[PDB]
Amino acid sequence: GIKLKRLSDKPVLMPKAENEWERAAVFNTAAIYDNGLFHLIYRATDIGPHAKYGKYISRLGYAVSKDGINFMRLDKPVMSNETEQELRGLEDPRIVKIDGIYYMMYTGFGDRFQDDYRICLATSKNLIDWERKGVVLDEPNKDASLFPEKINGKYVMLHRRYPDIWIAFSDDLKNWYDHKPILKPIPNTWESARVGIGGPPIKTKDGWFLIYHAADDNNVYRLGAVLLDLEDPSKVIARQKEPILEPELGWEKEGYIPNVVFSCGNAVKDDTIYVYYGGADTVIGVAILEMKDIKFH
Amino acid sequence: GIKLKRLSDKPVLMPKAENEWERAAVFNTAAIYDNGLFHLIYRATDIGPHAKYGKYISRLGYAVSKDGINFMRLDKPVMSNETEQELRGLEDPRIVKIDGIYYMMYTGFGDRFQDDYRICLATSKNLIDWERKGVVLDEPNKDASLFPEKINGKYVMLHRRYPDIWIAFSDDLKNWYDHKPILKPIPNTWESARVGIGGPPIKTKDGWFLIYHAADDNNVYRLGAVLLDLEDPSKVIARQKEPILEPELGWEKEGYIPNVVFSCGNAVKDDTIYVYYGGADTVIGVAILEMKDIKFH
Ligand SMILES: OC[C@H]1O[C@H](O)[C@@H](O)[C@@H](O)[C@@H]1O
Ligand SMILES: OC[C@H]1O[C@H](O)[C@@H](O)[C@@H](O)[C@@H]1O
């Protein structure tokens, strides 16, 4: 069934040594198609994003493209480390647009104590000027996004109480209810250690199309695909057995974190899904899936 | 009466050594306030912008700001030299937005023969992806802009048949009529050698507020102010005798072209006009005028 098709044998975005904030790595980017352009809000670090290299700080950059492959980038981050919950920065943003407002969920990494990372919310009208709304769930959690529309009058979010994907609901984004797990790892497979969402889910005639990531027992990260019921997204309609994307190219296999592909963003233009993904926690690539090719056994 | 008030004793944008296309000078920028942000489309050269420095090529960059002083900038130009009319590049853009479309008029400098510079038009929905519409007037001309709305069903443009400011009208942007001069130099003053528009005119209760530039007999460029009738913009209601801005700071007086302030852009936020201007054809500054302070003798 489903396989993502790389648009290039080269990354679409790489670190820039001359800017401290994005000197070492650019990865794990949000992506959205709006007003005739592809927009990336990308994670960037000053040093290799692993504790063995030091106290890396993650910040968020902006890039834009007409074609989804060739990007122009701003010289300064659109969000920087400002709060105590963001001592070590902002990570892995997922963006949806609802009624003219962009809702970005990101991980605020504080590292002040065990499991000091939290899902946080920021909003914008223009993808440049971001207003912090605070922590969303006060618990160790990440890999979160809103659904791109309200379902039955409610905001819906995916999250990740380790090691499973969860869903929850809210009337106002301030308090959440009906938490339940929807997707778990599967033993003795490529998806055995843990799972988490990729980018935000995409609405389809047949259901919500959701890309997810998983790690195996050697911490190799790959992407997979699930389909959720439109009206009750807690119901998994289908889940592909095999991955849709695995580390294959040199810059997916080799980098600060080896053997990783990881998505936080999937932009849609004319029934084609552009999946942006970090390679080896170092660079950003892009692969596509035409909506007509979303087919589960 | 009217004096522009600098927001800073430093430029808001300067050339960038790392990027050849904007290595020498950034100046003469379009400016517009849209969707909560100030946007600049700025002229940039690889080489000092005069024949004495070399065969400079002008290209157009993008910068953005929340506050109108501190800008983030894209790493590549949004328009580059692509046609024969643009052999030496694109200069001095003026932008207005009409019914969701940005209309940029710029000078295409060909330098293939005497007076080979032409007003050209490009349009965009997003300020990044520009569509060329071609030469507007096939004659030696520059310092042109649309009015930011139609007047009595017609597009209106200002232009500059040397050395005077002219106006013309069009049904469709393809053919122009009712050309007439509206503003001339005045002998034995600061505005003796020539005049031309600054940025696009701004609509006011009392008339169209239009900033203009002029050179004196030693080629010192300064800005002035005129008010035009709302319904017939060929009628000058008032013209201030004295300049509203003159080269004063070191980066206005010294640079590739000494003693120049020159505007192609005036963004409006909450009844304040932000006038962006090239200093010495080298850097970009900003000065403001509150609409309540638009008062002519
Ligand atoms: O969220 C905190 C921390 O968690 C993991 O170790 C990785 O995803 C890192 O990139 C991240 O900085
Ligand atoms: O327009 C052609 C040429 O005309 C003048 O010399 C100046 O305004 C230059 O900056 C420009 O390149």
Swiss-Prot record, chains A, B:
Pfam families: Glyco_hydro_130. One of its GO terms (biological process) is GDP-mannose biosynthetic process. It catalyses: [(1->2)-beta-D-mannosyl](n) + phosphate = [(1->2)-beta-D-mannosyl](n-1) + alpha-D-mannose 1-phosphate. Keywords: Carbohydrate metabolism, Glycosyltransferase, Transferase. One of its GO terms (molecular function) is glycosyltransferase activity. It comes from the Bacteria. Pathway: Nucleotide-sugar biosynthesis; GDP-alpha-D-mannose biosynthesis. SUPFAM superfamilies: Arabinanase/levansucrase/invertase (SSF75005). InterPro entries: Glyco_hydro_beta-prop_sf (IPR023296), Mannoside_phosphorylase (IPR007184). Optimum pH is 6.0 for phosphorolytic activity. Optimum pH is 5.0 for the synthetic reaction. Its EC number is 2.4.1.340. Belongs to the glycosyl hydrolase 130 family. Homodimer. Probably involved in a salvage pathway for GDP-D-mannose biosynthesis. Catalyzes the reversible phosphorolysis of 1,2-beta-oligomannan. In phosphorolytic reactions, prefers 1,2-beta-oligomannan with a degree of polymerization (DP) of 3, 4 and 5. Produces alpha-D-mannose 1-phosphate, which is the precursor of GDP-D-mannose. This is 1,2-beta-oligomannan phosphorylase. The lineage of its organism: Bacteria, Bacillati, Bacillota, Clostridia, Thermoanaerobacterales.
